[PDB]
Each structure stands twice: as structure tokens, then as C-alpha cells.
Design a protein around this ligand. Sequence first.
Ligand SMILES: CC(=O)Nc1ccc(CN2CCOCC2)cc1
Length: 119
Amino acid sequence: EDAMTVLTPLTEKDYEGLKRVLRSLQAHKMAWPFLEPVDPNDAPDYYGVIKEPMDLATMEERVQRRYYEKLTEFVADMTKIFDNCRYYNPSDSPFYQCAEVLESFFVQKLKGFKASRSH
Ligand SMILES: CC(=O)Nc1ccc(CN2CCOCC2)cc1
């Protein structure tokens, strides 16, 4: 990551952009498994294996409360969603496929956000 991403504080204008990025992911057709925390009734062994769970509703709460100080911290939480999914599920599962698709989409939107900060 470049120096702006790591070290430039998130301004109010930056936060409006983060809200838009998040809403785009929440509206994606392949985002359904990630919208809310993993349901322990459906996955009884999940919280024993995955030590730092993450989901898009937890990220929305954090954005609203201005939890993030630097872009790198927002990117780290998002990346945790996808990394947790690829570690827990096998490579041939529909969950794994959704992570592949949605991470690619996130990278496209994140590049757009970074461009709009510098110009
Ligand atoms: C985002 C995420 O990883 N979700 C998730 C949801 C349920 C399970 C539990 N299993 C999966 C396949 O077998 C039936 C139930 C595992 C992972």
C-alpha cells in the first residue's frame, strides 16, 4: 500500500466515499453470505476455528461510529471477511466462489476510491 493509504487520516469527505463503497458491496448479488455474522446454528464448529470473525453489518456499524482512522484499517477488516471464508470452506464450495467474486469487485471499487482522494 502507498503512503496515502497507510498514513493520511480519513476526512469527512473520505467517510462519504467509504459509505458508498460499503453500500455497493451490500447490494452485490454474491454478497448474501457476508451481510450478517455467520449463524452458529447453521455452522456449529465455526467460532471454534475462526478467531477473528467479520461481516458487512459489523463494518457498517464501525463506519457509522467513525471507528477507522486510516484507509489501511478499513481494507484490513474487509480482507478478513474474504480470508476467513477461504480458510473455513473448501475451494469447490459456493461460499468460496462468492469470496473470489466479491473480493475482485471490492478491489475495483477501492481503486476508484483511492483515485478520487488524490484528485
Ligand atoms: C460466510 C461463511 O463462511 N458462511 C458459512 C455458513 C454456514 C456454514 C456451515 N455449513 C456450510 C456447508 O455445509 C452446511 C452448513 C459455514 C460457513
